[PDB]
Amino acid sequence: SGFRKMAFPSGKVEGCMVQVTCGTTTLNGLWLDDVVYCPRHVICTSEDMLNPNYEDLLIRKSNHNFLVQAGNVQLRVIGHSMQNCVLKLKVDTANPKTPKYKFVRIQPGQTFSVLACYNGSPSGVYQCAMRPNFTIKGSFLNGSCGSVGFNIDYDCVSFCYMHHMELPTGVHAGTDLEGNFYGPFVDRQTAQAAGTDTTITVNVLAWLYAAVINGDRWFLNRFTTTLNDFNLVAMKYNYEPLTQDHVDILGPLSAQTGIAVLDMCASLKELLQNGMNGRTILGSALLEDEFTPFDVVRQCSGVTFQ
Amino acid sequence: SGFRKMAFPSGKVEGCMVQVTCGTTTLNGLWLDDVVYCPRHVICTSEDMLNPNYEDLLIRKSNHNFLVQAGNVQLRVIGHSMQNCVLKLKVDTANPKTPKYKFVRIQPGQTFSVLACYNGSPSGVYQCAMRPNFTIKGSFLNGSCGSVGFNIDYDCVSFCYMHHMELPTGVHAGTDLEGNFYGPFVDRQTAQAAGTDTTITVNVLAWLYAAVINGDRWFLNRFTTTLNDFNLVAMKYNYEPLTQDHVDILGPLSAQTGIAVLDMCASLKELLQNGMNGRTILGSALLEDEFTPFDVVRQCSGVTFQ
Numbered sequence: 001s002g003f004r005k006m007a008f009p010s011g012k013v014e015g016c017m018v019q020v021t022c023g024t025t026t027l028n029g030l031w032l033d034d035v036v037y038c039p040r041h042v043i044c045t046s047e048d049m050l051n052p053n054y055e056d057l058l059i060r061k062s063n064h065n066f067l068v069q070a071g072n073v074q075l076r077v078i079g080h081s082m083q084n085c086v087l088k089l090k091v092d093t094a095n096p097k098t099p100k101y102k103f104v105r106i107q108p109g110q111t112f113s114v115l116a117c118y119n120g121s122p123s124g125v126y127q128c129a130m131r132p133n134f135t136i137k138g139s140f141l142n143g144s145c146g147s148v149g150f151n152i153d154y155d156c157v158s159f160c161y162m163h164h165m166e167l168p169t170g171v172h173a174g175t176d177l178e179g180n181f182y183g184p185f186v187d188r189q190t191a192q193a194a195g196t197d198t199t200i201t202v203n204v205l206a207w208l209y210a211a212v213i214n215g216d217r218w219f220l221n222r223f224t225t226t227l228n229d230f231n232l233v234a235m236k237y238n239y240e241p242l243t244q245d246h247v248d249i250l251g252p253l254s255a256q257t258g259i260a261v262l263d264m265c266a267s268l269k270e271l272l273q274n275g276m277n278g279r280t281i282l283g284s285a286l287l288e289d290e291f292t293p294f295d296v297v298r299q300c301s302g303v304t305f306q
Numbered sequence: 307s308g309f310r311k312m313a314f315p316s317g318k319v320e321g322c323m324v325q326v327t328c329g330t331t332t333l334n335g336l337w338l339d340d341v342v343y344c345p346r347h348v349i350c351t352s353e354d355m356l357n358p359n360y361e362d363l364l365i366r367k368s369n370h371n372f373l374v375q376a377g378n379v380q381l382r383v384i385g386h387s388m389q390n391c392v393l394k395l396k397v398d399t400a401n402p403k404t405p406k407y408k409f410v411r412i413q414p415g416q417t418f419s420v421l422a423c424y425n426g427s428p429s430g431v432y433q434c435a436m437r438p439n440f441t442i443k444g445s446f447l448n449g450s451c452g453s454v455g456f457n458i459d460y461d462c463v464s465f466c467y468m469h470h471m472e473l474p475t476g477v478h479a480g481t482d483l484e485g486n487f488y489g490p491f492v493d494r495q496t497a498q499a500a501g502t503d504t505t506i507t508v509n510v511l512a513w514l515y516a517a518v519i520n521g522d523r524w525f526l527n528r529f530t531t532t533l534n535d536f537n538l539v540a541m542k543y544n545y546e547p548l549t550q551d552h553v554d555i556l557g558p559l560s561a562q563t564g565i566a567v568l569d570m571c572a573s574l575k576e577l578l579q580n581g582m583n584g585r586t587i588l589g590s591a592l593l594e595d596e597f598t599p600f601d602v603v604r605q606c607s608g609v610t611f612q
């Protein structure tokens with residue numbers, strides 16, 4: 001028993017991190033097969049950042065403007081192309097440590113592990129959620145660009161995030177691995193607002209089920225509610241509205257605990273309107289929204305990976 | 307910027323996990339050089355657990371009673387000895403993936419990463435603290451015994467914890483890698499109480515410094531206090547007393563922020579006596595005590611590892 005913010009084991013990813021330098025800018029790249037992926041603003045000087053023309057800037061670069069290092073091994077760049085906001089550097093050595101991988105674009109509310117890196121070396125791993133406004137509340141310093149987020153399905157690594165920038169609010173934005181930003185952001189140094197952030201309701205419910213599985217049950221009540229009536233109270237408190245798809249995805253946790261999804265919603269309704277009144281749930285005095293239903297199943301049933 | 311519960315990258319440890327079976331009991335082992343380490347109660351049947359005589363039980367076991375698997379490779383046990391509460395199985399193949407490692411015994415309040423495993427395969431990684439009463443608030447299911455906790459210093463892995471058991475309160479107990487339990491516990495199925503748990507004061511202060519570094523500063527005040535006066539208020543709230551050694555260890559964070567340790571104590575004093583009053587610190591409505599001063603420096607300065 002117990003419940004922790006658990007990351008995926010990071011071994012398969014650690015062997016793919018490289019250091020990429022262009023000019024005076026050093027950041028991290030992702031090295032899979034004979035391609036190194038990295039944020040395209042590696043080619044920019046500080047003065048280009050206000051209004052970059054990346055096509056023109058890339059045309060002025062030659063293959064030997066890029067230094068790519070895998071620890072001690074110096075990779076040689078054979079080609080370079082741009083896909084949306086990511087740069088693809090073709091290299092002369094394929095990565096022997098290339099895992100079975102795919103590139104996926106996640107949806108708001110889903111979670112992933114971040115391997116934070118500096119100079120191509122790993123600093124740490126942590127779990128986060130893609131917020132509804134397409135930012136992430138990460139932990140990143142100067143030099144972390146090109147660090148990646150990922151999930152693991154048995155022996156497959158799904159890459160879903162590459163880090164590009166920090167907003168003045170302290171939150172973080174980046175792209176998928178085809179180079180498309182999550183959210184409305186562009187890689188220029190201009191003021192760009194993120195939407196209103198909302199609380200991920202299906203995840204709060206998942207975490208309440210985790211609490212029941214762990215014996216923390218004081219908040220359960222006799223009442224019941226309809227999906228529409230719940231959503232009316234939720235939207236007042238800046239919670240995402242719950243859909244029938246969400247109810248279905250919570251099915252497995254409902255089955256294991258014997259508590260109907262709409263009964264759990266009736267408990268959440270009371271928590272929102274009355275507060276927690278000095279009690280805690282799973283050691284927290286706030287409602288937690290960064291575990292998916294699948295996270296809870298995985299951690300409460302001990303799924304493993306190759 | 308940002309602040310997360312960050313674990314160490316787990317790659318170097320993943321390649322050391324094996325599956326150990328004896329009788330109908332399968333759990334995890336740690337495979338370093340030609341030795342596999344595992345909890346000695348692998349040799350017990352359910353009926354032995356009430357009052358085991360481990361010396362006599364081990365004498366009745368032969369080398370071929372132990373099945374050790376590294377994925378597909380079947381290791382052959384050449385010898386077996388007991389060191390306190392850990393079993394050492396000598397094997398015929400040395401581990402090529404053996405990192406540079408040492409065995410250390412940590413002190414209460416220090417933190418480490420846990421690689422939770424089932425059947426020799428990794429499930430997840432998370433950060434925790436050794437509590438003052440020598441338990442840990444982990445996340446472990448049946449089958450997790452033999453999972454290990456560790457820190458990383460550049461290229462060295464320091465192993466500090468092997469998981470053995472769960473207490474009825476939902477918290478966890480285990481040994482160092484020389485087989486000695488943390489805390490007063492013995493590996494028998496009898497009622498055994500853990501001491502009173504207290505809050506790790508030096509870690510709360512470290513986390514308040516992390517909050518200042520991240521711009522969360524509302525709780526700072528003009529007041530000041532002496533170490534003795536602080537400790538009088540702390541002990542009333544079940545906080546560990548703060549020592550001069552703790553003040554020294556906070557030195558680096560004091561230097562970087564320009565806030566004297568005793569001034570931060572004066573802020574903590576007010577938080578304890580007046581509460582937080584609906585505000586949060588680093589997104590928490592509780593005072594967090596599972597980051598050491600070194601954790602904060604590492605995460606706020608981006609230390610990396612080989």
Ligand SMILES: *[C@](O)(C(=O)NC1CC1)[C@H](CCC)NC(=O)[C@@H]1[C@H]2CCC[C@H]2CN1C(=O)[C@@H](NC(=O)[C@@H](NC(=O)c1cnccn1)C1CCCCC1)C(C)(C)C
Nearest residue numbers: 026142143144145164165166167168187188189190191192
């Ligand atoms: C990353 O490339 C890295 O690790 N580089 C290694 C050190 C050399 C680096 C991470 C720094 C924390 N990322 C960046 O440098 C990005 C690139 C991509 C987009 C433009 C530049 C700058 N940058 C940032 O992350 C900056 N953030 C901003 O500039 C915000 N700007 C404003 O909020 C703003 C801008 N102008 C006027 C008023 N306000 C972002 C920019 C993009 C849209 C959201 C807001 C810094 C300041 C470096 C964090």
Ligand SMILES: *[C@](O)(C(=O)NC1CC1)[C@H](CCC)NC(=O)[C@@H]1[C@H]2CCC[C@H]2CN1C(=O)[C@@H](NC(=O)[C@@H](NC(=O)c1cnccn1)C1CCCCC1)C(C)(C)C
Nearest residue numbers: 332448449450451470471472473474493494495496497498
């Ligand atoms: C671990 O060996 C494993 O993963 N084995 C693979 C599945 C086959 C296993 C982890 C189970 C969650 N650990 C144990 O089985 C240990 C061993 C070591 C000590 C004795 C047995 C049982 N055990 C436990 O973790 C149990 N916990 C207890 O028995 C507590 N007992 C009581 O609180 C108690 C006992 N008698 C009367 C009244 N109360 C512990 C025992 C040790 C001291 C602290 C309290 C279970 C029930 C399996 C969690």
